[PDB]
Symmetry: C4
Subunit: 246 residues, 4 copies
């Protein structure tokens, strides 16, 4: 039946979550994060709009390959923190370890750039996504991340409703970034909870999976829905279910 | 009779001033402002032109929905300060108060983005306007504000004459920003005066209203007029009338 | 003979120099400058390319009168330092003096914007030009400024020659800014020399006048010349003549 | 016979290396560089993509002569450091030396702007190239630079292959910067090796020439190759050949 089709996505959810925890571990070996303040979601948001603004002024200042340069660089560095953390905790500070990581990132990005096999892409998308998930996950505690999630989810429902309405008005009345990006979003909370075989924040993971469930159901029906609020609403739900648990 | 039409604006003036005072109160619970030096107005102007300059490089770096993002965010935080002060006066530093404000701000902006009832808009315009009015009102004392006000009103009448003249030459010889913005302008002197049932800077308020009166008359006659100098000139008139009182 | 015609420019030279000295004075009442290091010309230049880059990115980000705004601000402030220096030297720190300056600058610029008599333009152009002349003039001593004059003059001879050639190849083989700007240029050395009835840097003034003589001669002949190097070469000449004097 | 024609390039390589050493010397007279950590290369790359980003936003902000101004200027200072080092090693700290370099730099750039003899251009290309070569050679040690070189050569071969692919796909299935720039590249490992009758990094020099040989072969055939990796791979080859020697 409908097993193998359209399950690869929540497969990627589970996967990215898993790799996000296993990435919880090695990162304190160098600190990271960035104080369980309620202002932190806001620092996040501000720095994100500046991040896009930068990305956009880049795009419009391309740069036939200079764009491809800049983003190749940024990717390479993020893989160097992934693999860096990995080996340099494992073999520890050894040259074997460090060179191991550099050579690692080199392999990965070089592959991703040479037109891979592009089932690979969902794999590296899974990896990076996990990476960021863990970073902001080690950074500060739930209630802040909760404010962030609710905030972002409402932003989404608003923008969706707006351009949907602007669809109905116009008569007479690469997506992967925002993708695997939104794959991460409600998982930064799954980390920052086990950072506050696992916790009762298994609950958050399954509630989240149920959010994606709702999404891939309703989207697969005619005339689409919002996006975040199913995911964040669902993850938050299952999470607060593992509250009435312990 | 002709009561209800075109009385909503002085309704908004009074309202904006009033809410600017009632917000004078709770704001000291967190300070804000910014020394009654006259160097403050120039710091002010410098910072305003830098702010718009940025707002516009945003505008041209749009951003199909990114623009609306950036400024929507700005709106949300500014409501977070409105309601933040609101609650943090009432129940004081309690968490209940703080969450109350955050959810307050979500309520307001989420509403404003979902196409409200749009007598709503003038209400929130009244609100924000009052907000800024109170802040710079708490920022420094009369004589600085007097210089600032005379200066601004003068810029206005000047550019009006320049581009008007440039209309009469060409033969052969979004508005809400400047709106509720200038709706604010002559009210900052109304606060910073009660900071220097009320003071004799009622005079400033009604003088301001007489400015608004003059404006709304001449505009309502053929061949329109300047804008600020009736409002600021009038407010200054009544304020400096409130010297012969106490 | 041709005395009254085409002498108004060297008239403006003398005048700007005169007003540059009389502005040497009140300016030390607050310090200013910006160490007789030879690195200073370079700081100047970098800051000038930034000054333009900003001015130009402004222009292209106009700003129907917003451009006129930004530059209105910058001007207003420069007149506030002119008049500020003037009165706040005269009556000293008195309220009478300071208000005297603000009202002064207001009068002057507001005049300049309401379509004055525009011989005024050469007068205020003379004033401002003098202002900056003195500012960098008090800023550091000769040998640095000597390097500056030579540097700028050679930049000029290159750029003019380059575009001359680009004219001659192209067959088959608002100006006031750079204007009164280039009027100042060789007088900043006339100040920073008397800052190290007057000195023998009368010499610089007359040498400068002779540079302008060569300029208005060759320019009034077919196929123009550089611009600076007659003036800076000349001012530096006459200046180094006031060396064999004392 | 065919001696004189087309031997000038490895001439410029060898030459640039030679002048890179002779300029290694005087440069320590003021320090320069920038800790043989491998964190240095990514700092580097980060900084280059940022620099280019700047060069390009300059480019879009032209600027009829403003561009040529900016970069001519930059050149001028870089010559100020070339010659600064030249004399200040030679004549030492004397004023005579310092002025000598400044006037030198003026002469050089002024020439370079007046359309030289263009065997001359290759001469100044050689000069500048040697300059930077010596700097990053003095900047940190081999193993970092090794990482840098391998990394860069890899970017190159990859982007070339990418746009090649995009050529063969489109059917149916200013250059001097990148030039003398990459001419420099494999000479920085040659310096930073002597900073770690000559070294066994003659091997690196001739290895570089053998790289240049390989390159100059494949390019001279139809359908070009990568570029860097013959040069860097070869330089690294000859260099790491100098290990079984000393």
């Amino acid at each position: 039946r409908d097993w193998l089709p359209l399950l690869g996505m929540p497969l990627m959810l589970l996967f990215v979550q898993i790799i996000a925890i296993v990435l919880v571990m090695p990162m304190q070996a160098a600190g990271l994060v960035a104080p369980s303040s309620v202002a932190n979601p806001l620092i996040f948001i501000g720095m994100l709009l500046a991040f896009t603004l930068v990305l956009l002024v880049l795009l419009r200042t391309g740069g036939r390959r200079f764009i491809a340069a800049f983003i190749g660089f940024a990717l390479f560095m993020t893989f160097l923190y992934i693999f860096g953390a990995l080996s340099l905790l494992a073999l520890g500070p050894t040259t074997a370890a460090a060179a191991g990581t550099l050579i690692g990132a080199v392999a990965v990005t070089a592959l991703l750039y040479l037109y891979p096999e592009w089932y690979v892409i969902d794999i590296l998308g899974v990896l990076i996504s996990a990476g960021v998930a863990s970073i902001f996950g080690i950074s500060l505690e739930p209630l802040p991340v909760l404010v962030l999630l609710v905030l972002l989810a409402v932003y989404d429902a608003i923008s969706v409703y707006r351009t949907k309405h602007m669809i109905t008005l116009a008569e007479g009345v690469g997506a992967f970034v925002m993708g695997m990006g939104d794959l991460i979003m409600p998982s930064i909370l799954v980390v920052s909870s086990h950072v506050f075989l696992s916790a009762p924040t298994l609950g958050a993971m399954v509630g989240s999976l149920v959010g994606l469930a709702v999404l891939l159901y309703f989207v697969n029906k005619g005339n689409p829905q919002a996006g975040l609020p199913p995911l964040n609403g669902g993850a938050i739900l299952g999470f607060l279910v593992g509250a009435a648990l312990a």
